Design a protein around this ligand. Structure first.
Ligand SMILES: Nc1ncnc2c1ncn2[C@@H]1O[C@H](COP(=O)(O)OP(=O)(O)O)[C@@H](O)[C@H]1O
Ligand SMILES: Nc1ncnc2c1ncn2[C@@H]1O[C@H](COP(=O)(O)OP(=O)(O)O)[C@@H](O)[C@H]1O
Ligand SMILES: *C(=O)CCCC[C@@H]1SC[C@@H]2NC(=O)N[C@@H]21
Ligand SMILES: *C(=O)CCCC[C@@H]1SC[C@@H]2NC(=O)N[C@@H]21
Ligand SMILES: [Mg+2]
Ligand SMILES: [Mg+2]
Ligand SMILES: [Zn+2]
Lengths: 77, 57, 449, 449, 77
């Protein structure tokens, strides 16, 4: 299907705060407008919004694992 | 043959600390900015030239 | 020593820096663009990070993404190299403040010397001779502009102090178009480099490009290595560069080197940089400083025996200079010959795939590049694909080897500037050595019926 | 200068000599075999001659065909190189008399020094220390043979004075098989090299191969360049050779060099040749002379800055030595690493086609070979396909570069000894430097259950 | 057809002596036993005999032109 990819480089975080629920989790589908993860860069915890409404098939990364530009994050079928 | 490599991933354990108040953002265009640069260009995002708030003083 | 660094660049200089790092046991991090996924230096590196799409501005100039990579991987410094973010003083400021070490000069001297006119002013203050000219950025006092033009002597040239890459310079033949020429030059500088500063400097008609390499740790130590000479140029872009330069007796060598060392001490210079000059009738007239590691750095390495990149990485680690001025020796003579993806005549880039490739090798021949079979040149950046060298115990031997190496060399799939290199090498005057910068421009010729 | 010469050899040394010739402006003639039609040096040469079919004896050793080529093309000298007809004194005699110039020593010294025992005798006469041993070719006086064996001390080794290529040598553990071992060694020497001469020489158990390079014009001038050390060997065949050798203080350097220079003067030596030795506890015991240009010649060129082949071609043109003993300097340290077409373990040649190839390049790295993509290695001669180098300002730097270069290097289609080179480079003791010749043989290990 | 090639290297001569008739000439066919040319080497003027009886279609060399091993000399059809 479709894969949404980080458009910038930085640490990958899914919970907005150190002890917080993940914005999204496997199973529950998302919509076009919704935050999927946090890509911290210089302490400015940015956010990523999907573009195609569909099920969250899986998450290809893990919290704390740095990611690069265009790094695939999640695949939506 | 290095010409064909494995495309390995990065190690998460590596950790560097950047000061908190040295990097700001411009939501108008999304380009991260150097706080001292923005503050020296009278709070004007030099990327999209979008004016922002400034302190009265 | 620096526990790890990021190669904030791409290609020949990227691969060369990677070799130097691995030599000194400093792990490496390759920040690449999405099109440069299968570069040599990328594939030979420990950790590879993608920071943006193919264009330069989105990906390699994306200072935020580079600092992101540097923070995530745990580096404690970065090497910019030359080009991309080489002289961006603001990049230096951000890297300094973010928490990492900027391999090179401190941003302050980047700002002082990146403005050509301030550089020339400080040079005058430090005793370095300078070309006659405005002695200041050009204002709108046309009367004063023409008075200065008359004082220095026509013809004159307009150069944007914030310009780079041999562009944004125009020659003014007379006052008739002085105003319009100045306006359009300023407009081009604004469009390209975002800076409008323009200044007037005398025009010389018989120059012999010189530049003297200097290493200073920024702690009161500044030494001067061998000379250089990039006389051959096309559109002010170097093609061939011989180091040292013919006819530079050791007296002049040491005379100018001592002054340049004193200048580096005064500016408190840190890192490797080169004071360009211009030569004629036994005189020197400063014209710029490339506060970085130049492109023709090798031709000083093979005649001096000192690896410049290693010296830089040592200075950045805080180590003072480990080489005295006396212990530096120039033993012989060198020559270098860039390889570029342009059409041999039209000078139009011709990116593509390289079907077949074969290095020269042989004694005294040095091949710096990243290209290889199956490597599709990206039509997205500079057109250089190799800095080839041929060290000899004299100019004749070095040229001879060059000729032989160029004979051996095969690069197929994309047109390249090898024919021109052979033809220059066979040129009688060039083999004599000592042509003016124009030599190649004049050989170009003119219209024929 | 010699108006033209013939490269009476093939491959790495052939291509290297071709480069030297073209440098000195001496036209070149490539004498190839029918299988070696598309060699590099063949294709880069002015004039190519085929002298015979694939086998060595029919084509490259066909002294008549080589002299035929040399006469038809108008040469006035020939370069044999090393291997094929390097030390064939009779080839030297014929080339001398036919009307051409033999690039190298006069045949007389070829005969005197190609017989190992006469070489050692003349060395003793000239003051060069020698290994304890027979001091003469072995006769059939078994009583005297065993008396000498007892006098020098067991164990002992039988070596054919006319043998070559690290073959035709056997170690004798005791008198029980002394007669049979001697008989079979003589038989092997007769079968291979047609010469039966065998002699007894003491056996050393802790040697460190040394060899000192010397240049003599044959006119009373003989100089000694840097040292060498080929400690690493497999089946007495060199793989890695470092130049100079660790721990050879300049005192020993000059001490042995002066004696070797005097020896060259006494023999009236002409051309480039190397006095092998054996080292332990600060002593030297001559063991042979390779009256030719060795294979590890580069590792003296890059540390001395002198091109040996050019010196040879100058001597052959009658020019005396242009380099004094004092003006020769050793500046740094080198390392070399042969590449061979054998299986990395079985040591069985694996000739074939090279699908993909990529030179190292980079600072200080020298790649000598002829191989390239599409080049089908001929299963008909020696298994060497490249002499790679990495010059450093110290042993650590040179090893580091070697490691990096070997990383870069890709040769695909035929198995090769790169894995072994990497493993040796990573070896702790080797990085320390100073292993005994056996080091690699002992690492091989033995049987396991 | 067949091509007979010099088995050694040396100067190519067709007339055995400086002023002599050529051993063979185009047109006239040869037999298995007959000298076709002279390949001088060290003043020892050797000779070449064909192996297949047939017409001399052409001569691929000229007198005075050095030849190498296995150098094609004449093609017999
Ligand atoms: N004052 C001058 N007179 C004559 N030629 C000049 C002058 N200034 C620059 N040039 C020519 O332009 C080249 C590049 O000048 P430089 O100031 O180094 O510009 P860039 O920053 O583009 O390299 C010089 O090597 C020289 O050939
Ligand atoms: N007397 C000796 N004692 C110990 N080892 C020896 C002796 N002679 C030769 N060798 C070993 O054999 C190697 C080759 O010997 P050398 O006489 O040069 O034979 P070759 O002519 O085959 O090269 C030496 O480098 C050394 O390692
Ligand atoms: C600053 O200390 C650098 C590390 C990043 C800290 C922040 S707190 C919010 C995020 N949660 C987490 O585990 N680390 C991130
Ligand atoms: C000896 O002088 C070398 C040249 C070869 C001479 C001989 S004489 C017989 C052959 N005919 C001819 O024209 N040259 C050959
Ligand atoms: Mg410049
Ligand atoms: Mg030997
Ligand atoms: Zn903005």
């Amino acid at each position: 299907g479709h894969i949404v990819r980080s458009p910038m480089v930085g640490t990958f975080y899914r919970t907005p705060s150190p002890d917080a629920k993940a914005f999204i989790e496997v199973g529950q589908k998302v919509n076009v407008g919704d935050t999927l993860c946090i890509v911290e860069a210089m302490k400015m915890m940015n956010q990523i919004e999907a573009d195609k409404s569909g099920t969250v098939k899986a998450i290809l990364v893990e919290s704390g694992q740095p990611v690069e530009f265009d790094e695939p994050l999640v695949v939506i079928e | 043959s290095w010409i064909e490599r494995i495309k390995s991933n990065i190690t998460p354990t590596r950790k560097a600390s950047i000061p908190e108040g040295v990097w700001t953002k411009c939501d108008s265009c999304g380009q991260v900015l150097y706080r001292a640069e923005l503050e020296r260009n009278l709070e004007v995002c030099p990327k999209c030239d979008h004016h922002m708030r400034m302190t009265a003083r | 020593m620096l526990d790890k660094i990021v190669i904030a660049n791409r290609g020949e200089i990227a691969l060369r820096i990677l070799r130097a790092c691995k030599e000194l046991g400093i792990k490496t991090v390759a920040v690449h663009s999405s099109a440069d996924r299968d570069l040599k230096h990328v594939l030979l590196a420990d950790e590879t990070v993608c920071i943006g799409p193919a264009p330069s501005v989105k990906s390699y100039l994306n200072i935020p993404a580079i600092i992101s990579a540097a923070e995530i991987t745990g580096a404690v410094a970065i090497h910019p190299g030359y080009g991309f973010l080489s002289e961006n003083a603001n990049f230096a400021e951000q890297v300094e403040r973010s928490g990492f070490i900027f391999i090179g000069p401190k941003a302050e001297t980047i700002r002082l010397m990146g403005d050509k006119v301030s550089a020339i002013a400080a040079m005058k203050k430090a005793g370095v001779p300078c070309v006659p000219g405005s002695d200041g950025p050009l204002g709108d006092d046309m009367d004063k502009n023409r008075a200065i033009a008359k004082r220095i002597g026509y013809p004159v040239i307009i150069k944007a102090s914030g310009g780079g890459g041999g562009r944004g310079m125009r020659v003014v033949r007379g006052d008739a178009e002085l105003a319009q020429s100045i306006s359009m030059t300023r407009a081009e500088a604004k469009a390209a480099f975002s800076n409008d500063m323009v200044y007037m400097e005398k025009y010389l008609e018989n120059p012999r490009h010189v530049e003297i390499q200097v290493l200073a740790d920024g702690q009161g130590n500044a030494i001067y290595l061998a000379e250089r000479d990039c006389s051959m140029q096309r559109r002010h872009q170097k093609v061939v560069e011989e180091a040292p330069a013919p006819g530079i007796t050791p007296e002049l060598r040491r005379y100018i080197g001592e002054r340049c060392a004193k200048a580096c001490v005064d500016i408190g210079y840190r890192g490797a940089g080169t004071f360009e000059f211009l030569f004629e009738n036994g005189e020197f007239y400063f014209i710029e400083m490339n506060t970085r590691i130049q492109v023709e750095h090798p031709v000083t390495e093979m005649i001096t025996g000192v690896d410049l990149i290693k010296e830089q990485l040592r200075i950045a680690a805080g180590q003072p200079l480990s080489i005295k001025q006396e212990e530096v020796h120039v033993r012989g003579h060198a020559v270098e010959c860039r390889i570029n993806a342009e059409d041999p005549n039209t000078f139009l880039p011709s990116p593509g795939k390289i079907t077949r490739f074969h290095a020269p090798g042989g004694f005294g021949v040095r091949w710096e590049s990243h290209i290889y079979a199956g490597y599709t040149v990206p039509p997205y950046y500079d057109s250089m694909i190799g800095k080839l060298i041929c060290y000899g115990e004299n100019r004749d031997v070095a040229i001879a080897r060059m000729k032989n190496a160029l004979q051996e060399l095969i690069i197929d799939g994309i047109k390249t500037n090898v024919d021109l290199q052979i033809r220059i090498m066979n040129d009688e005057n060039f083999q004599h050595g000592g042509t003016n910068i124009h030599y190649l421009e004049k050989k170009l010729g003119l219209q024929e019926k």
